[PDB]
Amino acid sequence: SGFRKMAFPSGKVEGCMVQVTCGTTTLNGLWLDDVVYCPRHVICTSEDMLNPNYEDLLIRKSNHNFLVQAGNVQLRVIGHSMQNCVLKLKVDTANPKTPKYKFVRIQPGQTFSVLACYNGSPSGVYQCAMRPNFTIKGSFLNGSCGSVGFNIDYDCVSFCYMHHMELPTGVHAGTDLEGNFYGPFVDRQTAQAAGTDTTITVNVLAWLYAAVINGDRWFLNRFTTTLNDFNLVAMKYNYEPLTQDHVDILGPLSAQTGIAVLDMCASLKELLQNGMNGRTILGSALLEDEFTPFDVVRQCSGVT
Amino acid sequence: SGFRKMAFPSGKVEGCMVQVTCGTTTLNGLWLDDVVYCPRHVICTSEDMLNPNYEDLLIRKSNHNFLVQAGNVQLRVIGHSMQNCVLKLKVDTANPKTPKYKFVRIQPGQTFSVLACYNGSPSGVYQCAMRPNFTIKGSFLNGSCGSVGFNIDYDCVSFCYMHHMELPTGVHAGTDLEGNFYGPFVDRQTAQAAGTDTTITVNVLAWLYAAVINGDRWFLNRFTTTLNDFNLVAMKYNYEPLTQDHVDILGPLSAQTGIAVLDMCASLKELLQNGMNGRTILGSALLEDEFTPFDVVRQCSGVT
Ligand SMILES: O=C(Cc1cccc(Cl)c1)Nc1nncc2ccccc12
Numbered sequence: 001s002g003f004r005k006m007a008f009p010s011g012k013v014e015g016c017m018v019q020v021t022c023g024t025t026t027l028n029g030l031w032l033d034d035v036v037y038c039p040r041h042v043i044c045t046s047e048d049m050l051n052p053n054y055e056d057l058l059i060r061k062s063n064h065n066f067l068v069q070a071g072n073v074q075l076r077v078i079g080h081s082m083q084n085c086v087l088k089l090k091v092d093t094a095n096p097k098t099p100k101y102k103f104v105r106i107q108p109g110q111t112f113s114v115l116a117c118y119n120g121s122p123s124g125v126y127q128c129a130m131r132p133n134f135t136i137k138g139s140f141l142n143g144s145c146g147s148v149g150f151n152i153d154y155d156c157v158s159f160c161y162m163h164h165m166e167l168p169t170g171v172h173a174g175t176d177l178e179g180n181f182y183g184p185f186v187d188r189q190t191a192q193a194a195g196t197d198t199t200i201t202v203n204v205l206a207w208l209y210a211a212v213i214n215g216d217r218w219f220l221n222r223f224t225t226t227l228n229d230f231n232l233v234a235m236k237y238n239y240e241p242l243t244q245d246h247v248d249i250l251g252p253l254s255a256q257t258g259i260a261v262l263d264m265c266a267s268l269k270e271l272l273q274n275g276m277n278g279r280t281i282l283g284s285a286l287l288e289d290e291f292t293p294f295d296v297v298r299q300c301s302g303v304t
Numbered sequence: 305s306g307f308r309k310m311a312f313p314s315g316k317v318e319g320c321m322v323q324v325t326c327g328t329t330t331l332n333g334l335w336l337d338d339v340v341y342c343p344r345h346v347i348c349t350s351e352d353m354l355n356p357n358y359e360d361l362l363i364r365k366s367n368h369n370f371l372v373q374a375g376n377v378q379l380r381v382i383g384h385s386m387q388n389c390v391l392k393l394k395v396d397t398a399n400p401k402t403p404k405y406k407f408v409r410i411q412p413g414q415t416f417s418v419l420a421c422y423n424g425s426p427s428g429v430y431q432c433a434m435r436p437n438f439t440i441k442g443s444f445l446n447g448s449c450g451s452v453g454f455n456i457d458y459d460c461v462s463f464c465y466m467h468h469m470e471l472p473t474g475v476h477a478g479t480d481l482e483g484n485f486y487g488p489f490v491d492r493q494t495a496q497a498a499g500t501d502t503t504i505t506v507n508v509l510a511w512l513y514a515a516v517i518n519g520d521r522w523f524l525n526r527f528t529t530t531l532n533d534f535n536l537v538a539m540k541y542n543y544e545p546l547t548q549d550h551v552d553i554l555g556p557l558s559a560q561t562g563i564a565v566l567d568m569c570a571s572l573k574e575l576l577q578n579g580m581n582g583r584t585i586l587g588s589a590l591l592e593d594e595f596t597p598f599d600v601v602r603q604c605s606g607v608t
């Protein structure tokens with residue numbers, strides 16, 4: 001019992017963190033096999049982050065200009081290349097701590113753990129989600145760039161995010177490990193406003209099921225609804241529309257609790273229309289949307 | 305920018321987790337040097353958790369009855385002893401992954417990270433606090449016993465908690481690594497109700513300072529208060545009394561923000577007396593009390 005915002009154990013990823021310095025900029029890199037991945041803005045000075053031509057700036061860089069350090073030991077860079085917004089630094093040594101891994105590009109609504117790092121050293125781990133506007137609400141300071149987001153399935157780390165920047169609003173933007181930004185963001189110091197940060201409905205429903213499993217049941221009502229009626233309410237409250245694909249994904253939680261998905265939707269509709277009335281659900285006074293249905297089952301089943 | 309419930313990177317502790325089985329009970333153990341620490345209730349059957357005499361039950365156990373497995377490899381037990389509510393199993397092999405470590409007994413209000421484990425394998429990491437009633441609000445299932453709580457200072461892991469049980473209310477109780485329970489709890493399947501779960505005032509104030517540092521400032525008011533006036537309000541709202549020791553600890557955050565501690569107390573008094581009015585602070589609709597002043601500075605400074 002109990003329900004917490006839980007991150008994956010970070011050990012497998014800690015063993016991959018390295019420091020990358022180019023010129024006067026230092027950030028984090030991810031060392032997998034004989035390649036170090038890092039944001040390409042490591043090559044920029046502050047004076048050219050305003051409008052950088054990365055291909056042109058990269059011409060003035062050689063392998064010896066990329067200083068890569070794993071703990072206190074220096075790695076020898078024998079090649080470099082740019083793939084989208086990331087640099088791939090080939091080193092002469094395979095990381096002996098390389099876990100089984102995959103690079104995945106996640107969809108909005110999916111959650112992941114972040115290992116916030118500075119100077120190639122891990123500071124902390126937390127859980128977050130790819131927002132519907134393609135930002136993440138992380139906790140990152142200067143030097144955190146190159147920290148990564150990931151999920152773990154038994155022994156395989158699926159890396160999904162690499163941090164690149166903070167928007168003027170204090171929300172975060174970055175790429176997958178192929179260097180493609182999530183959303184429309186660009187690695188440049190210019191006006192980039194985020195779109196509507198819509199609530200992830202299927203995750204709210206999953207967390208209401210977690211609340212029932214963990215004994216918080218006051219919000220269950222005598223009502224039901226339809227997908228189309230529920231979606232009228234979701235639109236009004238800046239919630240993502242619920243689809244039959246989302247209903248299907250909530251099947252296991254509906255089976256565990258005996259609460260039909262559309263009945264849980266009617267409970268959520270009443271909470272949206274009436275608020276919490278000063279009450280809490282799983283220690284929160286708001287509807288939590290950064291637990292997926294998979295996260296709830298995993299946490300409520302103890303998958304290792 | 306951004307502020308998250310952040311746990312310490314769990315790698316150093318993952319390397320210490322082992323599985324301990326005695327009879328038909330399996331739980332987690334912590335392997336440091338040549339000793340494995342685990343809850344003494346590993347020796348109990350369900351039939352004797354009602355009123356166990358641990359010294360008597362332990363007489364029927366020999367070193368070969370304690371099966372200790374680190375990953376897929378078995379450890380040889382060459383000694384065993386009971387220290388308070390923990391068993392210490394001496395093994396013939398020092399854990400090669402033993403980090404620099406200390407055993408500390410924490411005070412209520414202090415936070416720590418938990419690495420929830422099942423079968424000696426880590427499932428997840430989360431942050432929590434020792435509540436003023438000496439329980440923790442964790443996320444633990446059957447088999448999680450022996451999972452540990454810790455803090456990290458650079459390269460030293462200070463272990464502060466070992467999980468032993470869940471109370472009928474779904475809150476958690478356990479010991480320090482010397483086997484002494486936090487609070488009045490006993491390792492027995494009997495009536496153990498928790499006391500008032502009081503809010504940790506100094507942590508709420510620290511988190512209001514984190515909110516100001518991160519730009520959430522709507523709650524700052526034109527008022528001040530005194531410790532004695534503030535404490536009249538704290539009593540009414542089941543908040544811990546604020547002392548000059550707590551004011552002293554909030555000094556660095558007061559200096560960073562330029563907001564005198566007693567002014568922040570007057571802001572907190574107004575939030576207690578008037579509520580949030582449907583507004584949020586750092587993405588929460590309630591006053592968060594599981595960030596210490598040290599956690600706020602650490603997170604807002606990027607200590608690795
Ligand atoms: O935003 C940047 C640098 C940057 C600027 C413009 C474009 C690009 Cl690609 C990168 N880095 C940081 N990232 N996250 C949190 C930060 C908190 C404070 C200062 C810096 C932060």
Ligand SMILES: O=C(Cc1cccc(Cl)c1)Nc1nncc2ccccc12
Binds near residue numbers: 353444449468469470
């Ligand atoms: O409570 C116990 C076993 C136990 C019973 C009485 C006394 C003692 Cl010392 C230990 N273990 C568990 N711990 N945390 C969460 C749990 C969720 C479900 C089931 C079991 C859980």
